Design a protein around this nucleic acid. Structure first.
Ligand SMILES: [Zn+2]
Ligand SMILES: [Zn+2]
Ligand SMILES: [Zn+2]
Ligand SMILES: [Zn+2]
Lengths: 66, 48, 116, 1131
DNA sequence: AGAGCGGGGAGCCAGCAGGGAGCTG
RNA sequence: GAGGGAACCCACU
DNA sequence: CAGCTCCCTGCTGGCTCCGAGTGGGTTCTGCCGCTCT
């Protein structure tokens, strides 16, 4: 839904890296190089940014009830 | 059937009354007997 | 082998065998009308028990055009000598006893079918 | 330019992406409903006979052009409004559109002209509209327009909303109609039988089946008889031919036996001729048939009329239902007898019941058409009864009073709501499960349920033949996705590119056949039949043709360019038996295949280039269909094609298998369905594990739909952090799985650690779970309405005070507001009250009927929605939100059938770690792999390690030579890991290296709905049942567990008689009765005054106290109700 | 007058219709 | 401190 | 010795059975019109 605050496996902060990852992707970095530029060296964090589905952008398309 | 055998009526209706009473008693004991209509509710579900 | 049916000519129906002892011969006498007919062949009922050796009349030549049927080049035709042939098996219950290949010539207008 | 093999994977996935860009996944439901609405309803209305009522003046009622509105809601004020689907879901409204018909009433009077009255647009009922079809309000809307309506653009549609409940129509596998099928009856009086489920096309009427059977040997020979419809005995077939108007024998045998040099056919028709010799005239034959009908006749004329109408309108209706059609019906009956003779001689082979060439699929279209046919017949019956009741005495009838609009509306609503398909008054004989509540647990559940087929076969059948995976399911039906248990092999799923034909008119094919040298049956001698190819169109023998090469090539050329032959028309040529069958009817399932001609694909690089820019050429899948490149092939036509699995099969080989390929597969991984296409490397798994994963990917937890906040679903499960898989197939792009994913990529070590993962269990990381790993929410919605039950019983949403309300469960009402409802944000517990409803009874005037929360369910009220239902009452729905943290006993599954429960949770410092400090999220047992043979799990871990190091998303499409274990191993070794995925793990407790090296890697695990807190149950004592006074049913009613008969047998074998008594007497239903010591019947016993009395004996001193189960007392009293005396003698 | 009452398989068993023997006037 | 049945469907081992 | 009686056999119809235990859900009772004021 939204990027997890921490990596599940180790606990590295990955919640501050989703928008940076998207900005690096639209700067035509490859995904491996974008992950390497963010300091995610263990594959447990690379799956955390790599496999993320950001559903909250589509939940914000619905007009707020409250 | 008590009324139609006390307030006297013809045999052609007392026979139907006897047949229907026999059907009701049998379907009280045995509803799943074949060859006869099933005892049914107003919802159409058969009697237990 | 098998002897066919005989048909009446007047009432368009079947004939039936009968033995007239006046000439002591066999006639095909219809029993809807009074039509009679002498018989060329004396065979009335005939049965085949192990005489199922001829599967070739049931095969039609059209099966040469089947894309799913297997083609071979090692069995050339005897009639026209074409290299291509299609090979299959006889698929009846009376051919479960055999796995004999029946071949049909692939070339158009030939239609020759054989075995082995 | 031919597509070179290095570009072929990209090319085939581009054309597959084009197919799934245009058609989509629920296209068959929407197409069937659209063709039902546009064509079938009007056909049913028009084909209904006009109502001709005469007492007298004569009234003719004719029905005309139908009109269907959009789905509208009428409130109690009567003002129409456009009904949106979320309003129907929230307010429990039926998403239906009103159906208006035009009626013409003509009056005929003695010595007076007609009087025509035009009731334009007469309301006759409401048709439930299927979501996202043509006549839905969401049709044609963009994604922004759908999000403004609080709808999900990913939601497929294809379902109905009945009373706020989403209902899907499961397709039903019927036998194919109008086709002669010959089977050898097992242990019957007939050796071979030939049936035809005959039904006239484009007319919804029930199929009339005619059997043409041949008797067993153990008379002279073999007799062919005919089991006609509505003729209750077996008419000999020659008598049927006589009754059709054929006195002669060359007439009958030219209709039956097409080649007269063939002797065996004659030797088998000889007993059938010679048994029916005594009947020689047409009307004599008609008398012989009509004497044994369902309604016999005392008059010969009545029997002649009966047999004439049976052979006119009931015996083979599809070939002809009209007069002068004796020759076409007689040729078809002769064809049936001919096929019977061919199969009995062994020359032809018996038909297969499980072959889907012999089966059609009733989708929403034909099923709703059958319903609407019956219900419109009911409506016309009601109109004729009302109008006849008036014109018996009254002058005239107003028609709008005669139109019972509840017939169509409530009948369609009932059948779509209950699933009992048919009429409510015959619900015991109605087929159930046709309509089902749409599964909304994840998106895979929704798609799988919307693409579901069902064999109408009893699930208690011990025969395996309909359950078998038949060979003809290739590419049409998923081979893996089927239920486990009693419905295995009966409930099925479509493959991805399988499309079910919607139906077409046979006519333009018939004019083309007329003007393409086909000689009609009505204008030929039978002697021309013996070497000509018969032509069947929708099972109707229409003629013969003498050049079948050019006819079949011409027909295929027309179909391949979207001419006269439409794309779904199936055209089979049976070469060996000289037949051409053309099927245009609905229910045929087909799939697109590439066309191979002269060992070359017709799909070339220009098509791929044009499809590469689908947005800016307006090139699509339909242009590929129009280009003669792809072709829709169904099951009977797939028996005559020669498929290439890949274009590599077209290449010349050193051992050439085939050089006459007719079609080629687009990609073989389109034999899988929706739920089996989530499995990475399905071909490396054992097939039971593929079936298990097809089952358990529907129970996984993810985000089931995007607008889950608007919806008040009874049960909803939402994962906190769903991830798309690192190891995906290319079919997962068209299932939208990377937008609504249903699992998390775990770090899984397959290790033996502490013993707590043995026998399918897993060990989870407590520290990972603390960070949100597999955390979820369970939403439960409760509905309650102020129902007005007459004048007295007025239930109202009022906050209950104990001073005025009775019948409470003695729970606090303080969390309720003063409007009688709880408010969002309040923590609730299993005893708390969320809705306060009070009913007014005729001090305690009010009785408390408050809605309580489910037992032991902690939660917080997420939403309260207050509205008016269709009846104008106040209606409320409360959604309660419970956060489910992963817990010991929660069921987690991978994508390979490696289900299990969490056996223990260790913290991060306790779980084993690699040299980088990577601890696994899940540890599974090694022993779960070997007998299971889920090598796809190991390869998924390896490929996920490679994909997480590389940054790619791994491709695991089933049949892909470019991906193999050695390639992935070399790739993993390129990142400084061991090539086979093993790592040196250290013990978390001691720090010491584990001697073995542990296979660890990212694997996609999914959390299943089967949580332990939703299943834990216990009882000491509590609610008992009303009748037998035994404990209740299920944990929802605080019930007890069943100590069934096998438990009794086990406790007998144990010898534990006192434990057997405790379970079966004390812990279930202890009871004491008083029994007369003389007669043994239970006796009256006033225990207050110690007055023990037995009538029937006048006994007052000899009465005994007997302890029994209450069910024993109930049994004995049922027996004494049954005029049986169990005389319980204590001596 | 609205409120309320009425109206599929599988396998075994039992009875009846066909035999073949014996019997008597 | 305890107030419905039945039918059906799905699922679980 | 012909016709009748009296028990073996063949047939068809009737009848009764079809794993154990669990969750969850929806939908139905009940079905509508009356005769009295
Ligand atoms: Zn990490
Ligand atoms: Zn004759
Ligand atoms: Zn030749
Ligand atoms: Zn007594």
């Amino acid at each position: 839904m939204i990027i997890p605050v921490r990596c599940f496996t180790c606990g590295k902060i990955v919640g501050n890296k989703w928008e940076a990852y998207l900005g690096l992707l639209q700067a035509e970095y490859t995904e491996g190089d974008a992950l390497d530029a963010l300091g995610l060296k263990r594959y447990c964090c690379r799956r955390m940014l790599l496999a993320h589905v950001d559903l909250i952008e589509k939940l914000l398309n619905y007009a707020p009830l409250e | 059937l008590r009324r139609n055998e006390q307030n006297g009526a013809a045999a052609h209706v007392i026979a139907e009354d006897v047949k229907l009473l026999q059907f009701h008693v049998a379907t009280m004991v045995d509803n799943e007997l074949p060859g006869l209509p099933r005892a049914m509710q107003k919802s159409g579900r058969p009697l237990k | 082998g098998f002897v066919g049916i005989r048909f009446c000519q007047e009432c368009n129906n079947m004939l039936y065998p009968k033995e007239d002892k006046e000439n002591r011969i066999l006639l095909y006498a219809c029993r809807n009308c009074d039509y009679q007919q002498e018989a060329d062949n004396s065979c009335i009922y005939v049965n085949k028990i192990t005489h199922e050796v001829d599967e070739l009349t049931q095969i039609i030549a059209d099966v040469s055009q089947d894309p799913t049927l297997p083609r071979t080049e090692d069995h050339p035709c005897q009639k026209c000598g074409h290299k291509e042939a299609v090979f299959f098996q006889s698929h009846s219950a009376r051919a479960e006893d055999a796995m004999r290949l029946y071949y049909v010539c692939t070339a158009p207008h030939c239609g020759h079918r054989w075995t082995e | 330019d031919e597509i070179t093999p290095d570009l072929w994977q990209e090319a085939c996935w581009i054309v597959i992406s084009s197919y799934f860009d245009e058609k989509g996944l629920v296209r068959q439901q929407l197409d069937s409903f659209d063709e039902f609405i546009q064509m079938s309803v009007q056909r049913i209305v028009e084909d209904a006979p006009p109502i001709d009522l005469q007492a007298p003046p004569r009234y003719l009622l004719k029905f005309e052009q139908i009109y269907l509105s959009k789905p509208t809601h009428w409130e109690r004020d009567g003002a129409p409004s456009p009904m949106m689907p979320n309003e129907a879901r929230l307010r429990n409204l039926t998403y239906s559109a009103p159906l208006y018909v035009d009626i013409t009433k003509t009056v005929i009077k003695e010595g007076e002209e007609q009087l025509q009255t035009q009731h334009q647009k007469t309301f006759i009922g409401k048709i439930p509209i299927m979501l996202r079809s043509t006549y839905c309000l969401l049709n044609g809307l963009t994604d922004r327009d759908l999000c403004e309506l609080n709808e999900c653009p990913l939601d497929p549609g294809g379902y109905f909303i009945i009373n706020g409940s989403e209902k899907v129509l499961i397709a039903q596998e019927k036998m194919a109609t109008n086709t002669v099928y010959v089977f050898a009856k097992k242990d019957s009086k007939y050796a071979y039988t030939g049936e035809c489920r005959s039904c006239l096309e484009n007319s919804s009427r029930p199929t009339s089946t005619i059997w043409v059977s041949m008797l067993a040997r153990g008379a002279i020979g073999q007799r062919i008889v005919a089991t006609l419809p509505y003729i209750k005995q077996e008419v000999p077939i020659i008598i049927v031919f006589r009754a059709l108007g054929f006195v002669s024998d060359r007439d009958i045998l030219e209709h039956i036996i097409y080649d007269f040099e063939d002797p065996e056919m004659m030797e088998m028709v000889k007993p059938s001729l010679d048994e029916a010799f005594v009947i020689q005239e047409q009307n004599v034959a008609l008398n012989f048939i009509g004497s044994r009908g369902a309604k016999p006749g005392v008059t010969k004329e009545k029997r002649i009329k009966y047999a004439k109408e049976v052979l006119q309108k009931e015996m083979l209706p599809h070939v002809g239902v009209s007069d002068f059609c004796e020759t076409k019906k007689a040729y078809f009956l002769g064809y049936m007898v001919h096929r019977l003779l061919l199969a009995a001689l062994g020359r032809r082979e018996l038909d297969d019941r499980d072959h889907y060439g012999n089966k059609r699929l009733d989708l929403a279209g034909p099923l709703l058409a059958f319903l609407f046919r019956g219900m419109f017949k009911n409506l016309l019956k009601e109109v004729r009864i009302y109008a006849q009741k008036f014109i018996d005495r009254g002058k005239d009838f107003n028609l709008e009073l005669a139109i019972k609009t509840r017939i169509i509306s409530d009948g369609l609503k009932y059948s779509l709501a209950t699933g009992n398909w048919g009429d409510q008054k015959k619900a015991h004989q109605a087929r159930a499960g046709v309509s089902q509540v749409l599964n909304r647990l994840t998106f895979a559940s929704t798609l799988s349920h919307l693409r579901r087929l069902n064999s109408p076969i009893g699930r208690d059948g011990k025969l395996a033949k309909p359950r078998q995976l038949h060979n003809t399911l290739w590419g049409m039906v998923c081979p893996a996705e089927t239920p486990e248990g009693h419905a295995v092999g009966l409930v099925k799923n479509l493959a991805l590119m399988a499309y079910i034909s919607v139906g077409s008119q046979p006519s333009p094919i018939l004019e083309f056949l007329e003007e393409w040298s086909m000689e009609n049956l009505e204008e030929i001698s039978p002697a021309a039949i013996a070497d000509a190819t018969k032509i069947f169109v929708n099972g109707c023998w229409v003629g013969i043709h003498k050049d079948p090469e050019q006819l079949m090539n011409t027909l295929r050329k027309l179909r391949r360019q979207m001419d006269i032959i439409v794309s779904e028309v199936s055209m089979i040529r049976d070469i060996r038996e000289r037949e051409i069958r053309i099927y245009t009817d609905a229910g045929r399932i087909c799939r697109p295949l590439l066309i191979v001609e002269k060992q070359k694909l017709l799909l070339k690089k220009r098509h791929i280039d044009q499809l590469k820019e689908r947005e800016y050429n307006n090139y699509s899948w339909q242009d590929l269909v129009a280009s003669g490149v792809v072709e829709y092939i169904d099951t009977l036509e797939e028996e005559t094609v020669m498929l290439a699995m890949t274009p590599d099969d077209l290449q010349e080989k050193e051992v050439a298998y085939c050089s006459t390929y007719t079609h080629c597969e687009i990609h073989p991984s389109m034999i899988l369905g929706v739920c089996a296409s989530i499995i990475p490397f399905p071909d490396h798994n054992q097939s039971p594990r593929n079936t298990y994963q097809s089952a358990m990917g529907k129970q996984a937890m993810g985000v089931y739909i995007t607008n889950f906040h608007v919806r008040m679903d009874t049960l909803a499960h939402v994962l906190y952090y769903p991830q798309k898989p690192l190891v995906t197939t290319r079919s997962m792009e068209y299932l939208r799985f990377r937008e609504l994913p249903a699992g998390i990529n775990s770090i899984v070590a397959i290790a033996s650690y502490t013993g707590y993962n043995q026998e399918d269990s897993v060990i989870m990381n407590r520290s990972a779970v603390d960070r949100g790993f597999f955390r979820s929410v369970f939403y439960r919605s409760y509905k309650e309405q102020e129902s007005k039950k007459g004048f007295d019983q007025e239930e109202v949403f009022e906050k209950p005070t104990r001073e005025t309300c009775q019948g409470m469960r003695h729970a606090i009402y303080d969390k309720l507001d003063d409007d009688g409802l709880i408010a969002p944000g309040v923590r609730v517990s299993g005893d708390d009250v969320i809705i306060g409803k009070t009913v007014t009874l005729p001090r305690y005037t009010k009785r408390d009927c408050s809605t309580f929360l489910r037992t032991s369910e902690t939660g917080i009220v997420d939403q309260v929605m207050v509205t008016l239902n269709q009846e104008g009452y106040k209606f409320c729905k409360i959604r309660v939100r419970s956060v489910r943290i992963p817990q010991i006993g929660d069921k987690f599954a991978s994508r390979h059938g490696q289900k299990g429960t969490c056996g223990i949770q260790y913290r991060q410092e306790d779980m084993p770690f690699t040299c980088e400090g990577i601890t696994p999220d899940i540890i599974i047992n090694p022993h779960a792999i070997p007998s299971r043979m889920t090598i796809g799990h190991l390869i998924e871990c390896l490929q996920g390690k490679v994909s997480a190091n590389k940054g790619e998303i791994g491709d695991a499409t089933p049949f892909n030579d470019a991906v193999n274990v050695q390639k992935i191993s070399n790739l993993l070794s390129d990142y400084g890991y061991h090539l086979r995925g093993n790592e040196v793990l250290y013990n978390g407790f001691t720090g010491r290296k584990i001697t073995s090296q542990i296979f660890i890697g990212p694997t996609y695990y999914q959390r299943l709905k089967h949580m332990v807190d939703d299943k834990i149950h216990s009882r000491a004592r509590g609610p008992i049942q009303i009748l037998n006074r035994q404990p209740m049913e299920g944990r929802s009613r605080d019930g007890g567990l069943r100590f069934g008969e096998m438990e009794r047998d086990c406790q007998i074998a144990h010898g534990a008689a006192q434990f057997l008594r405790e379970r079966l007497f004390e812990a279930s239903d202890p009871y004491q009765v008083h029994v007369c010591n003389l007669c043994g019947i239970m006796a009256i016993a006033n225990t207050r005054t110690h007055t023990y009395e037995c009538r029937g004996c006048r006994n007052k001193t000899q009465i005994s106290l007997v302890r029994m189960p209450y069910a024993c007392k109930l049994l004995f009293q049922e027996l004494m109700s049954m005029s049986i005396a169990p005389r319980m003698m204590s001596v």
